[PDB]
Every structure is written in C-alpha cells, then in structure tokens.
N, CA and C atoms as an extended XYZ file, in Angstrom:
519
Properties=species:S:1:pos:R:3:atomname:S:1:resname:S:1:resid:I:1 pbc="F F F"
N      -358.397      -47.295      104.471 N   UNK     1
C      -357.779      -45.932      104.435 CA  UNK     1
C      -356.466      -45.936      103.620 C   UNK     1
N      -355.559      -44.995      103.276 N   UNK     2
C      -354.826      -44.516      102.602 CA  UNK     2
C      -353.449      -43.787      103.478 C   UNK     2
N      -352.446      -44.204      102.630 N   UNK     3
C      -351.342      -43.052      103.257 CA  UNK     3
C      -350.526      -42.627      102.143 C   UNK     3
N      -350.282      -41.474      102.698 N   UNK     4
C      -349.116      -39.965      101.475 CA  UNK     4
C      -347.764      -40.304      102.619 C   UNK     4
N      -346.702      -40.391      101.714 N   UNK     5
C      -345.433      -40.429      102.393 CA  UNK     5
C      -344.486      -39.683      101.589 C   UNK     5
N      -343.995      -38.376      102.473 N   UNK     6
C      -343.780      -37.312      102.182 CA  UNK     6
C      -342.624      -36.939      102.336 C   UNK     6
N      -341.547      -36.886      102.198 N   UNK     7
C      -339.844      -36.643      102.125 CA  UNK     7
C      -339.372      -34.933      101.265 C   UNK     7
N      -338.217      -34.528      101.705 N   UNK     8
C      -337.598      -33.755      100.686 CA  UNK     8
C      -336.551      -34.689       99.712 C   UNK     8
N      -336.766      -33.866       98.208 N   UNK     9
C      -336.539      -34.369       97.386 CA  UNK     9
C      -334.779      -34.515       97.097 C   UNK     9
N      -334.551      -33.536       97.858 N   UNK    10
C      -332.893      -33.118       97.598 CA  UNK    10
C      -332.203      -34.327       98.217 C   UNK    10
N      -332.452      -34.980       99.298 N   UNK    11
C      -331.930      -35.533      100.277 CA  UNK    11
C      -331.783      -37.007      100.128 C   UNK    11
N      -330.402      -37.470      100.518 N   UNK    12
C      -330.161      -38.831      100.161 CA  UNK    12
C      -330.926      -39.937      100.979 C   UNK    12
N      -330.899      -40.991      100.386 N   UNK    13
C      -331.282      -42.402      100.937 CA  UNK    13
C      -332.791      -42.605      100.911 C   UNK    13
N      -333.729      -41.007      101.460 N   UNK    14
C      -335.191      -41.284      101.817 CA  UNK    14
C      -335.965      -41.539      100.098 C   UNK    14
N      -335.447      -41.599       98.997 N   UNK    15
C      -336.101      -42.406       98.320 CA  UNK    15
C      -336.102      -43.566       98.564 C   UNK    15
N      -335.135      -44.232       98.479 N   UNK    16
C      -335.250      -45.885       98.549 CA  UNK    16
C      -336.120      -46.343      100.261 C   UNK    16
N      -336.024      -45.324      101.209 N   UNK    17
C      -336.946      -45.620      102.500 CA  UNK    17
C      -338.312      -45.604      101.567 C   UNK    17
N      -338.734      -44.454      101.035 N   UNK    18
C      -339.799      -44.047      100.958 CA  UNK    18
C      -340.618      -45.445       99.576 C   UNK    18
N      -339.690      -46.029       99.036 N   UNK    19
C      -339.779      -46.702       97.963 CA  UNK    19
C      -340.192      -48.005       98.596 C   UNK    19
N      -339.633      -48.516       99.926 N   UNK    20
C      -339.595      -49.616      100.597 CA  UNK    20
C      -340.882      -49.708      101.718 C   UNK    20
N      -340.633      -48.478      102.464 N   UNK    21
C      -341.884      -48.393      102.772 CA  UNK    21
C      -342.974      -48.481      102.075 C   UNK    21
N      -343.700      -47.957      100.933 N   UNK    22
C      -344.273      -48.308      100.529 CA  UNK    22
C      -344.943      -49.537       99.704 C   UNK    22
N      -343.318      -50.409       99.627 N   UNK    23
C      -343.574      -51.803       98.951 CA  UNK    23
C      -343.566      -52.611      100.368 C   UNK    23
N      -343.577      -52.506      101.266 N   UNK    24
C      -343.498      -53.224      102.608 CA  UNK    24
C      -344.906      -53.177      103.223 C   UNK    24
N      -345.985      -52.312      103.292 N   UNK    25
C      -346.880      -51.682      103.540 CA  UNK    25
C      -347.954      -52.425      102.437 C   UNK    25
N      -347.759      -52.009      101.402 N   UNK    26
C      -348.035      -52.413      100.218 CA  UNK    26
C      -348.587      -51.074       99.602 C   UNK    26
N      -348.446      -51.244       97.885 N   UNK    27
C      -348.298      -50.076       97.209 CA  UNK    27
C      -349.474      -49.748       96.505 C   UNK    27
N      -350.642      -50.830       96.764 N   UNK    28
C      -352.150      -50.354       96.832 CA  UNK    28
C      -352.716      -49.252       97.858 C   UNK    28
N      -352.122      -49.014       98.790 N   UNK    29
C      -353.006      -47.892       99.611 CA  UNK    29
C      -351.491      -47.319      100.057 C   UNK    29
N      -350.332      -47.237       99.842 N   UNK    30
C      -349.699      -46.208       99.897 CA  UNK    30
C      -349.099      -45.602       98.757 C   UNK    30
N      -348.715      -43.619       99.065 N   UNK    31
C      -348.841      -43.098       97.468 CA  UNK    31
C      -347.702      -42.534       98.254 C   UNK    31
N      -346.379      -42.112       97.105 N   UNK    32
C      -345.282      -41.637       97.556 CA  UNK    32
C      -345.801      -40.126       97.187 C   UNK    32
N      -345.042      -38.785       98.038 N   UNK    33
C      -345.322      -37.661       98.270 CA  UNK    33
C      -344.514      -37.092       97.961 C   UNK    33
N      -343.216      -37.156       96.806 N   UNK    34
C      -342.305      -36.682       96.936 CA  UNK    34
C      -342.198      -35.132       96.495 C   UNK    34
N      -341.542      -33.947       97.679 N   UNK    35
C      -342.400      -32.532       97.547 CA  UNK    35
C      -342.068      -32.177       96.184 C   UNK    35
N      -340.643      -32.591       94.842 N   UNK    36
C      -340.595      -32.101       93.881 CA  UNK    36
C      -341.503      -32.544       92.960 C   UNK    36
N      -342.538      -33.891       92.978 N   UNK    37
C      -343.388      -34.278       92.311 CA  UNK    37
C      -344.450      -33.757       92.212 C   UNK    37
N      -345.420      -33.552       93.771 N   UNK    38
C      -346.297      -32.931       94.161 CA  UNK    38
C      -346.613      -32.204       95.280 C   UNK    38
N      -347.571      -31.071       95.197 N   UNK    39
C      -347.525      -30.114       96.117 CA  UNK    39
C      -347.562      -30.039       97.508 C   UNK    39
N      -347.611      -29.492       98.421 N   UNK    40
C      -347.863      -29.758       99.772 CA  UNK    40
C      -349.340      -29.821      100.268 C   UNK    40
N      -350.300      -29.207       99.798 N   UNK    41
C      -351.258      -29.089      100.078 CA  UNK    41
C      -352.490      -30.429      100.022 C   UNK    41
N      -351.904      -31.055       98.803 N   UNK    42
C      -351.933      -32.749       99.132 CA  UNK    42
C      -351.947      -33.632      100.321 C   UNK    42
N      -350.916      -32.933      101.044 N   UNK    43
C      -350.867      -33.387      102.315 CA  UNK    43
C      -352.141      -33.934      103.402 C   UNK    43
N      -353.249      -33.018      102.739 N   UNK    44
C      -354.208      -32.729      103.299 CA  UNK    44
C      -355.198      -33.754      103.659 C   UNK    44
N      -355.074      -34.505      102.169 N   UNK    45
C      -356.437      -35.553      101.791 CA  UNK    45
C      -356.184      -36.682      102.445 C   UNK    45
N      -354.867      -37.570      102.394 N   UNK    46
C      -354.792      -38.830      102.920 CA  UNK    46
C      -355.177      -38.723      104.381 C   UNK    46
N      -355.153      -40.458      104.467 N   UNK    47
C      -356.355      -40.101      105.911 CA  UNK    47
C      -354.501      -40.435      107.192 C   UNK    47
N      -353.478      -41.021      106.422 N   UNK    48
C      -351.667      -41.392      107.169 CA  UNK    48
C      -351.669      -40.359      106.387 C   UNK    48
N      -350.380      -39.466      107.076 N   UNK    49
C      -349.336      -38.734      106.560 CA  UNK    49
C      -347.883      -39.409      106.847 C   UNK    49
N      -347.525      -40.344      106.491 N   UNK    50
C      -345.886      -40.725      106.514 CA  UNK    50
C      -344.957      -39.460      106.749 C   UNK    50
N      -344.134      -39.010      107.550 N   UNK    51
C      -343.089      -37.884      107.421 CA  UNK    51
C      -341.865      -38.505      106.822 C   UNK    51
N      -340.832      -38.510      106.319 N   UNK    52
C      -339.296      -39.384      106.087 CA  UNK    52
C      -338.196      -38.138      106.068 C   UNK    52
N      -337.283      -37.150      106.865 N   UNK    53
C      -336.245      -36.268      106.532 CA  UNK    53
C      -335.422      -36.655      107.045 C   UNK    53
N      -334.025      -36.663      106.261 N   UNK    54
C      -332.881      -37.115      106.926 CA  UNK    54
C      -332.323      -35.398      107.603 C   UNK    54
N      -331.522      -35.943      108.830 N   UNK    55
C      -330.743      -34.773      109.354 CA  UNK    55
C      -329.290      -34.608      108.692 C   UNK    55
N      -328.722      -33.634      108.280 N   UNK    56
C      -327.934      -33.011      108.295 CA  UNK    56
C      -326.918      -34.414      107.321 C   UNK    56
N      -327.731      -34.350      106.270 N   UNK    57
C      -327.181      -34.980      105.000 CA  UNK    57
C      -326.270      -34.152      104.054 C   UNK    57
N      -326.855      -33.663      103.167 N   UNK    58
C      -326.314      -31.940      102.790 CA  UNK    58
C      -326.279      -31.368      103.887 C   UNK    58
N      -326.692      -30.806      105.158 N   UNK    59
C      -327.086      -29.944      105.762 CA  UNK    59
C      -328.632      -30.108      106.141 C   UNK    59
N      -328.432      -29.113      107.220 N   UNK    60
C      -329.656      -29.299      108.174 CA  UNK    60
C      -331.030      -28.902      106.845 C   UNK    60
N      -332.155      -29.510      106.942 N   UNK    61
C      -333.497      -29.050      106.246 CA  UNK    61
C      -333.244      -28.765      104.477 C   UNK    61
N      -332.465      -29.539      103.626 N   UNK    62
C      -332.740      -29.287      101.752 CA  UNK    62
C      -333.622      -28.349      101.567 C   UNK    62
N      -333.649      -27.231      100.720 N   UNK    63
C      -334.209      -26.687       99.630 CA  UNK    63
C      -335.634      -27.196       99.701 C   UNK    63
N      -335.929      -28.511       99.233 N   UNK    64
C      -336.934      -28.551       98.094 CA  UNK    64
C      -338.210      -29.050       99.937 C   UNK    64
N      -337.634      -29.230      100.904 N   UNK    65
C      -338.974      -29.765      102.289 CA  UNK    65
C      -338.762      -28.133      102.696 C   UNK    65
N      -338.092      -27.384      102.847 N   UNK    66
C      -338.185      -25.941      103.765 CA  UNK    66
C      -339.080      -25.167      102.707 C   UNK    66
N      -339.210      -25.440      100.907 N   UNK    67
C      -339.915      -24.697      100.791 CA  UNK    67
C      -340.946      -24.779      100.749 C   UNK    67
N      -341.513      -25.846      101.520 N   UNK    68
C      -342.637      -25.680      102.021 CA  UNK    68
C      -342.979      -26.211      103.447 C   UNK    68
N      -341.843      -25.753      104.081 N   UNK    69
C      -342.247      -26.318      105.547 CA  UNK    69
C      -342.564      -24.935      106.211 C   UNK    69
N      -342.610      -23.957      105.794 N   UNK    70
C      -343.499      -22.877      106.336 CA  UNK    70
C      -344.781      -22.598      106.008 C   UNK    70
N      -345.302      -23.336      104.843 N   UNK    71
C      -346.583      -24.045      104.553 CA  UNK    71
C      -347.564      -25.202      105.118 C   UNK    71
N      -346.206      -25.857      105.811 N   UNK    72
C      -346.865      -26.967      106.315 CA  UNK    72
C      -347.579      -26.598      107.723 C   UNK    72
N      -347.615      -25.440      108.346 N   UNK    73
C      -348.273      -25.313      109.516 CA  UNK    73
C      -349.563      -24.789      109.036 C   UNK    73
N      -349.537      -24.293      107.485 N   UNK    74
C      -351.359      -23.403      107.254 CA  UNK    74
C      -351.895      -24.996      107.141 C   UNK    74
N      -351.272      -25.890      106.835 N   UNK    75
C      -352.196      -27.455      106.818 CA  UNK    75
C      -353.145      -27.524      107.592 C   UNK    75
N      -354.591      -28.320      107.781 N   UNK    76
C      -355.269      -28.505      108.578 CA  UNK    76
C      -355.025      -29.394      109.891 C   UNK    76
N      -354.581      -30.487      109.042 N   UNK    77
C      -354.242      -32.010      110.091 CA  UNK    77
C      -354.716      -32.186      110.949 C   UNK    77
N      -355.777      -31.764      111.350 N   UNK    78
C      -356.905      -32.258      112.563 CA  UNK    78
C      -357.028      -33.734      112.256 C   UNK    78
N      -356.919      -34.333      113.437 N   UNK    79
C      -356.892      -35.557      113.921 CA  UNK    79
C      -356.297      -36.753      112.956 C   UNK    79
N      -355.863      -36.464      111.822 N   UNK    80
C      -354.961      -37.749      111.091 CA  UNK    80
C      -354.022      -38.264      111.620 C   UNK    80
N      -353.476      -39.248      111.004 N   UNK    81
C      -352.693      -40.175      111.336 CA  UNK    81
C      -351.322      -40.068      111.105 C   UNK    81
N      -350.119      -40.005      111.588 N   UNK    82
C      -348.824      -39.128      110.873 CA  UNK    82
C      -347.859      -40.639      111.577 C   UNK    82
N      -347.021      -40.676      110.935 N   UNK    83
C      -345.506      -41.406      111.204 CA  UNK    83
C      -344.617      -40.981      111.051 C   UNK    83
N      -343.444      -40.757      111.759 N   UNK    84
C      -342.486      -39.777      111.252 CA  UNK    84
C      -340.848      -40.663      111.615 C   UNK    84
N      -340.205      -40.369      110.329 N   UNK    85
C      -338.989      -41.372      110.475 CA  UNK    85
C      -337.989      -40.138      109.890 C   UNK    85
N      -336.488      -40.489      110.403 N   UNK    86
C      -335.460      -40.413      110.059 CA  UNK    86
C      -334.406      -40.920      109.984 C   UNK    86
N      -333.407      -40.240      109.399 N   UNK    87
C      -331.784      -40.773      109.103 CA  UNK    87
C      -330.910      -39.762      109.970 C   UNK    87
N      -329.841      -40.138      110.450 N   UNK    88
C      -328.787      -39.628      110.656 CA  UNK    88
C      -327.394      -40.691      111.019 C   UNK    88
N      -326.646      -40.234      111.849 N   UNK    89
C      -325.438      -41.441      112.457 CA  UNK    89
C      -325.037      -40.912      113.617 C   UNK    89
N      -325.455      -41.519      115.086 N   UNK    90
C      -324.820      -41.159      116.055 CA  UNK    90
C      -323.655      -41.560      116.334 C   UNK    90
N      -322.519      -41.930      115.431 N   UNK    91
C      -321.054      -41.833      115.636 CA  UNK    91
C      -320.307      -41.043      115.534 C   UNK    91
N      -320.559      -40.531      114.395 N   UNK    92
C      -320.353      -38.839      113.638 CA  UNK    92
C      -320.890      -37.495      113.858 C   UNK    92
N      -322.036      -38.012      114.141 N   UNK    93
C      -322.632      -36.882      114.662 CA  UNK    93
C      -323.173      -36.894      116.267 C   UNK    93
N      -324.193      -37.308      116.638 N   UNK    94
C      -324.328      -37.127      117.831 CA  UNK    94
C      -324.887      -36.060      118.222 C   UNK    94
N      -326.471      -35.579      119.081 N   UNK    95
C      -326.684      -34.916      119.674 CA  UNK    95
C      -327.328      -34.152      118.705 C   UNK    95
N      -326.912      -34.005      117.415 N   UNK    96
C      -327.733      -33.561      116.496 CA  UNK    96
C      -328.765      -34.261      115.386 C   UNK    96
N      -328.750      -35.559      115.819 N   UNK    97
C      -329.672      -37.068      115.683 CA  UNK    97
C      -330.925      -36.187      115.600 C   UNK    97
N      -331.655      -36.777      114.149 N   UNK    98
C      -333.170      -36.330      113.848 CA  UNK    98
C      -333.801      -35.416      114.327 C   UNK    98
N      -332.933      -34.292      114.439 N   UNK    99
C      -333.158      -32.439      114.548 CA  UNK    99
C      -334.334      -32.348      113.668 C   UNK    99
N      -334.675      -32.659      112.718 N   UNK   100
C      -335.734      -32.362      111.938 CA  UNK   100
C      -336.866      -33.399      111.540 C   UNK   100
N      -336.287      -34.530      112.541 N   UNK   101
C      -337.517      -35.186      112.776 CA  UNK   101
C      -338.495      -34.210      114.130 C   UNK   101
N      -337.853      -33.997      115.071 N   UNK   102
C      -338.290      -33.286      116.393 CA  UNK   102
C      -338.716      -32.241      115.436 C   UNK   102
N      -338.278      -31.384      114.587 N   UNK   103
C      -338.790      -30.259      113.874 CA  UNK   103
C      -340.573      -30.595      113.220 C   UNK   103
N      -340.610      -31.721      112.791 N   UNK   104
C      -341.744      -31.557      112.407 CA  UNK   104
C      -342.913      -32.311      113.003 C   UNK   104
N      -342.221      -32.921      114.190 N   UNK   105
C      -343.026      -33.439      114.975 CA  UNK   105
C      -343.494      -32.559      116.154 C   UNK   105
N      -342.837      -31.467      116.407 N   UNK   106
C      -342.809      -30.104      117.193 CA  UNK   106
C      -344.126      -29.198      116.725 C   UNK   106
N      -344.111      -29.092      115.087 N   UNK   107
C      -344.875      -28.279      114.205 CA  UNK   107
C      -345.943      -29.207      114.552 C   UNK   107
N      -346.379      -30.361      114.385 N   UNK   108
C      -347.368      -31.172      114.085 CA  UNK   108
C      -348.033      -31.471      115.705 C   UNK   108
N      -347.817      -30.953      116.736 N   UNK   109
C      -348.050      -31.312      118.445 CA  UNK   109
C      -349.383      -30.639      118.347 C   UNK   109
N      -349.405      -29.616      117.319 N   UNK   110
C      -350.304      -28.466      118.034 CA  UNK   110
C      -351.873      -29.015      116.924 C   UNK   110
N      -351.259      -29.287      115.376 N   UNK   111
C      -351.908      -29.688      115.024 CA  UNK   111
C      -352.983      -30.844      115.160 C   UNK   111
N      -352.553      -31.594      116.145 N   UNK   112
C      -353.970      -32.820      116.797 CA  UNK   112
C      -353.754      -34.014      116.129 C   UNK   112
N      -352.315      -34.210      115.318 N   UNK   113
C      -352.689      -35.321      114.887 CA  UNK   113
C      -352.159      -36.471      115.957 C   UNK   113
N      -352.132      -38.118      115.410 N   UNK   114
C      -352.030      -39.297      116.389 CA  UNK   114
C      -350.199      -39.823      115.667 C   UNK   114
N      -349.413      -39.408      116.491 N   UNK   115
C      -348.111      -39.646      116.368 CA  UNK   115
C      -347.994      -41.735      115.971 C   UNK   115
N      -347.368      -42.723      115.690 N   UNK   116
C      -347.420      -43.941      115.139 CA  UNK   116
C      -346.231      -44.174      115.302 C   UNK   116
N      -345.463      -45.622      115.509 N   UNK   117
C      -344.229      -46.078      115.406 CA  UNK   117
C      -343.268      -45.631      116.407 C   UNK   117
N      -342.595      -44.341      116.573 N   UNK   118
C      -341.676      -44.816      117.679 CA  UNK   118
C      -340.320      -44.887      117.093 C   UNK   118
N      -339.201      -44.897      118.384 N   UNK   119
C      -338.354      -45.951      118.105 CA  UNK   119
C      -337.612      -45.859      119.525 C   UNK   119
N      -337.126      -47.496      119.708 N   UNK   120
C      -336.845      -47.231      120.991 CA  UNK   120
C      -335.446      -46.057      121.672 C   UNK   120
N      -335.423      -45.874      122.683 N   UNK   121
C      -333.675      -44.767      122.641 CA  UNK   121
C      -333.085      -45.615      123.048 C   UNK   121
N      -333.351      -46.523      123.851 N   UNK   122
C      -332.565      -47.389      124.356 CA  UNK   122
C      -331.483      -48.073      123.718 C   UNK   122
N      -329.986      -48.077      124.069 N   UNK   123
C      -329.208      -48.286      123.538 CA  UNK   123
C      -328.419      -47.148      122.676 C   UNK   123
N      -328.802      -46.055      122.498 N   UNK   124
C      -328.633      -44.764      122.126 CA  UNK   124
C      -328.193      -43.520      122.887 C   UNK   124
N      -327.342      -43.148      123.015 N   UNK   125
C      -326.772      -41.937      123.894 CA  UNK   125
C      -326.800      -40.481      122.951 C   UNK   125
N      -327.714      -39.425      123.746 N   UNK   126
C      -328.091      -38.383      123.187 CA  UNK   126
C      -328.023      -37.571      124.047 C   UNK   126
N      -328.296      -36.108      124.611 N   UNK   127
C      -329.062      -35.350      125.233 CA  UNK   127
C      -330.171      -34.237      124.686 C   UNK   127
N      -330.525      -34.586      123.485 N   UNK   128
C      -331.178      -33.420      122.918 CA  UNK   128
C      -332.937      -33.986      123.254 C   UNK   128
N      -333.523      -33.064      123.669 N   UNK   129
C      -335.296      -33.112      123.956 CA  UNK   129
C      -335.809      -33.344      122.518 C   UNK   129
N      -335.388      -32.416      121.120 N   UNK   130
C      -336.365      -32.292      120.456 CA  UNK   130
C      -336.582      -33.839      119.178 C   UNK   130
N      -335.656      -34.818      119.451 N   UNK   131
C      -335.868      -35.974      118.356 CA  UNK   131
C      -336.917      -36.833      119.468 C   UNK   131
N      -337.292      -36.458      120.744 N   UNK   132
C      -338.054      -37.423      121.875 CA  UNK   132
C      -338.778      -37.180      122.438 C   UNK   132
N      -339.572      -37.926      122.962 N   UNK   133
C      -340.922      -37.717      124.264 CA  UNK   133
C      -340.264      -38.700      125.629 C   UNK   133
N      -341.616      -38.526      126.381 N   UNK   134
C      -341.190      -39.392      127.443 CA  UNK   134
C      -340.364      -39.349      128.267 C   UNK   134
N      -339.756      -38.050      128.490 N   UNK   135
C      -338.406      -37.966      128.888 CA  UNK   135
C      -336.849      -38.242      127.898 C   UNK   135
N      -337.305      -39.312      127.485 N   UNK   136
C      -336.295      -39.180      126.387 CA  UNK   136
C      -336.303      -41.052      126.572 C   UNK   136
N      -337.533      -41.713      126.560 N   UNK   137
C      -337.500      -43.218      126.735 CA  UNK   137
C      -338.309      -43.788      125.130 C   UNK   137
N      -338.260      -42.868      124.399 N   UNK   138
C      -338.665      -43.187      122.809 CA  UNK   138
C      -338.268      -41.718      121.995 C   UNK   138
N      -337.580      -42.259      120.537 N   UNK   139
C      -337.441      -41.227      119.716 CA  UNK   139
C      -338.850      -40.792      119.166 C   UNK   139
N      -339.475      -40.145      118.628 N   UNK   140
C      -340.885      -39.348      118.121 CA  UNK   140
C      -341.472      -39.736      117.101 C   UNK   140
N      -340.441      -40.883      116.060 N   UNK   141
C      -340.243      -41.520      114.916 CA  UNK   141
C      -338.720      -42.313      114.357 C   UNK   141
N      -338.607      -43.082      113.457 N   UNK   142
C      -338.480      -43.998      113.479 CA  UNK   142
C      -336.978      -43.391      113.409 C   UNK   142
N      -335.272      -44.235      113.474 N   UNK   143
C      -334.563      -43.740      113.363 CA  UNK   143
C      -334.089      -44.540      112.313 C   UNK   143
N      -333.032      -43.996      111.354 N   UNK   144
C      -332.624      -44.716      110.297 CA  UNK   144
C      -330.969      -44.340      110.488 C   UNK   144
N      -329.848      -45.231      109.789 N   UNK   145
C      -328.495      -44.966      110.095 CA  UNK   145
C      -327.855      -45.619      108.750 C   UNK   145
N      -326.779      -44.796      108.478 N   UNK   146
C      -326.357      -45.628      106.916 CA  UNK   146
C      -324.385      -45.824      107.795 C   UNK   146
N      -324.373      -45.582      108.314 N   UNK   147
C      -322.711      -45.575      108.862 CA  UNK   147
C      -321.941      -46.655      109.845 C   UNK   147
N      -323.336      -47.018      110.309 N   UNK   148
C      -323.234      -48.025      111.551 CA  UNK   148
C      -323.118      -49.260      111.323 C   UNK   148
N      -324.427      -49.313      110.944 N   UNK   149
C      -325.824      -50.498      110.923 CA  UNK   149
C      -326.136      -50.493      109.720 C   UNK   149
N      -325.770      -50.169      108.653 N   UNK   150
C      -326.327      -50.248      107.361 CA  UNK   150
C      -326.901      -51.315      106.723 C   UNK   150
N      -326.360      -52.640      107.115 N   UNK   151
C      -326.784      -53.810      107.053 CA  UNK   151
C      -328.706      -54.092      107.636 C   UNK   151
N      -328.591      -53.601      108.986 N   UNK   152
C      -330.034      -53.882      109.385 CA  UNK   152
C      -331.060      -52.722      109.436 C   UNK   152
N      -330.084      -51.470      108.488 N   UNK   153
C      -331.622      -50.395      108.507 CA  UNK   153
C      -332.482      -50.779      107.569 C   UNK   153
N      -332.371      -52.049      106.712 N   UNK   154
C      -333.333      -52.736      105.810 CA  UNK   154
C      -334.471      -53.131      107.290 C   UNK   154
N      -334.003      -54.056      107.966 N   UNK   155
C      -334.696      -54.338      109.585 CA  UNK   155
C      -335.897      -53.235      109.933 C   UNK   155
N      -334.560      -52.325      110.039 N   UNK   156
C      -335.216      -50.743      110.815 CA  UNK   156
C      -336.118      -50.743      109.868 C   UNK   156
N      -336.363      -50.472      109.060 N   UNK   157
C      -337.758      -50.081      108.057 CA  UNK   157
C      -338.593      -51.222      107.936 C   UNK   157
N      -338.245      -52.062      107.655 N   UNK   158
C      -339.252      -53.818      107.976 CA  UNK   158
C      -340.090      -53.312      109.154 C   UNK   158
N      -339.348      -53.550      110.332 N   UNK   159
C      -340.298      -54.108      111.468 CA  UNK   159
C      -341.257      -52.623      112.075 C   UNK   159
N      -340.328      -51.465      111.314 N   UNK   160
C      -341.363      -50.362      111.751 CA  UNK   160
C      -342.385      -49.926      110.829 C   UNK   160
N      -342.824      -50.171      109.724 N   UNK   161
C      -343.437      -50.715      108.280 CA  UNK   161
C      -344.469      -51.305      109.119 C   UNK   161
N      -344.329      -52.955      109.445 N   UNK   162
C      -345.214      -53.682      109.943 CA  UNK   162
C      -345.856      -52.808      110.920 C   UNK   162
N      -344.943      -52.250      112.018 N   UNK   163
C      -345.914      -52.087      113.216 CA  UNK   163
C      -346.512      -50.837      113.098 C   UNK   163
N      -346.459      -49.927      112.010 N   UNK   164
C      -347.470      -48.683      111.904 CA  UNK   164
C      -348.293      -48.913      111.446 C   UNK   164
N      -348.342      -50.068      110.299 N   UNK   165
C      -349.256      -50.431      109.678 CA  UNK   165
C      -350.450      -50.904      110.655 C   UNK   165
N      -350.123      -51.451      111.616 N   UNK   166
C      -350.957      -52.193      112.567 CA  UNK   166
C      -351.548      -51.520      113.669 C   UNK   166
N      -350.704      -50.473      114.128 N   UNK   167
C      -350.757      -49.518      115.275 CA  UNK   167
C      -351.905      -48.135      114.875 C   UNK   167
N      -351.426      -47.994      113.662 N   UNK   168
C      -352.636      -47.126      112.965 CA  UNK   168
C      -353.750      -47.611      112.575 C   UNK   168
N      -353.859      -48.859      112.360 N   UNK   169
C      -355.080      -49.956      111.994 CA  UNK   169
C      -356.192      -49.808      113.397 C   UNK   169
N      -355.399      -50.218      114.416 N   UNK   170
C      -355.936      -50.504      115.695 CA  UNK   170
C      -356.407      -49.064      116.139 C   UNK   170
N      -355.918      -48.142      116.030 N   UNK   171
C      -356.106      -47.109      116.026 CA  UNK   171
C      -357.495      -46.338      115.933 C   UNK   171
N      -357.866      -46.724      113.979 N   UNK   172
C      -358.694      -46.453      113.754 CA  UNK   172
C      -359.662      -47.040      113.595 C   UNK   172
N      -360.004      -48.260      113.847 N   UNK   173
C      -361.125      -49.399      114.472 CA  UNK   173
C      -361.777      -48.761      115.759 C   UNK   173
C-alpha cells in the first residue's frame, strides 16, 4: 500500500517533518501532499493519509490548508488509514497545543477512518479535550516542539515514523 502526506504549505517546519517522514518510512511508497503542489481531492486515492499542521505558527489554520479544509469533509475516507501529527510549544503556549490537530481529527471521527500513532500526554500538562482521546491519556497524533526539545523532535518523528509504519501494517494484514 501507499501513503499521501498532507500539510499546509504556508506553515513552518512541516516541510522538513513531511520531508523526513517520508525518507524515514521510505520514499518508495510515500508521496508528499503538499496542498500548494497538489489538490485536495487527491486525498482520496492513497490507501494512508498522513495529516502534519502546526498550531498557531503564523496563527491558528494558514491560508493555503483552510482553503481547503472545508473541502476536506466532501472527501470520502471510508475506512483508510490516517496519521495525524503536529507542532506547537507547551511553554509558550499551552492549552492551545495541536488545536488543529483535534480540528482535523474531529472532522475525520465521522468519516470512518483508522486513527495510527498517538502520542503519549504523559508528562504534558494541558486541559483542552480537542488535541485527545481517552480522557486525555493520549494526544490523537503525534506531537512535535521546536522551543523545548528541539534537539529530540528529530526522535519524535523517528520513533513515530517507525511505529505507524508498523501499526498500519498490522492493521491491514
């Protein structure tokens, strides 16, 4: 099988995620999605949909993913495979941590697809429902940080790389 990994274009850092992920994964069966390259409706065919939006980089949701994130609900996405990662910094910010990861993992509940990866909360102080499940004992997708930890969000994308790769494998066996 195949995966589309899909980011807004305006927004810092998620190229080089989206660049890494895909060389981590490997870059035979993953295709970068980037929305100023190609359309949304693409979205459709791969059998993974990768998600990657940072929160409140410029500002909450860039230009170039909102104009078509009111598109992204006519999508089909019956039963595919989705991963969904973000950026933010809970030092600075706080509480408003991967608002738009929960955003499109919110949009995507109804659609049927099989959520992948994770990340743990543990060790993380929040109160917001929409970046989590479980009560709030896993984020919805992966978390990324350039303020903190900048050193090991190379890590953060490594070991969550490996384990979607595997988790979606097992998955679909």
């Amino acid at each position: 099988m195949n995966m589309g990994l899909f980011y807004g274009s305006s927004t810092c850092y998620t190229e080089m995620a989206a660049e890494k992920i895909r060389d981590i994964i490997g870059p035979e069966l993953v295709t970068l999605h980037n929305l100023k390259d190609d359309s949304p409706k693409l979205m459709e065919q791969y059998d993974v949909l990768i998600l990657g939006i940072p929160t409140w980089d410029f500002g909450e949701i860039q230009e170039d993913w909102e104009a078509v994130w009111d598109q992204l609900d006519d999508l089909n996405l019956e039963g595919k495979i989705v991963a969904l990662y973000g950026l933010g910094d809970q030092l600075g910010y706080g509480e408003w941590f991967l608002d738009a990861l929960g955003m499109l993992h919110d949009k995507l509940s109804t659609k049927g697809v099989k959520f992948v990866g994770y990340w743990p909360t543990e060790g993380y102080e929040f109160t917001s429902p929409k970046p989590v499940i479980a009560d709030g004992q896993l984020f919805v997708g992966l978390a990324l940080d350039e303020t903190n930890q900048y050193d090991l969000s190379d890590e953060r994308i490594q070991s969550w790389c490996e384990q979607i790769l595997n988790e979606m494998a097992e998955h679909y066996a």
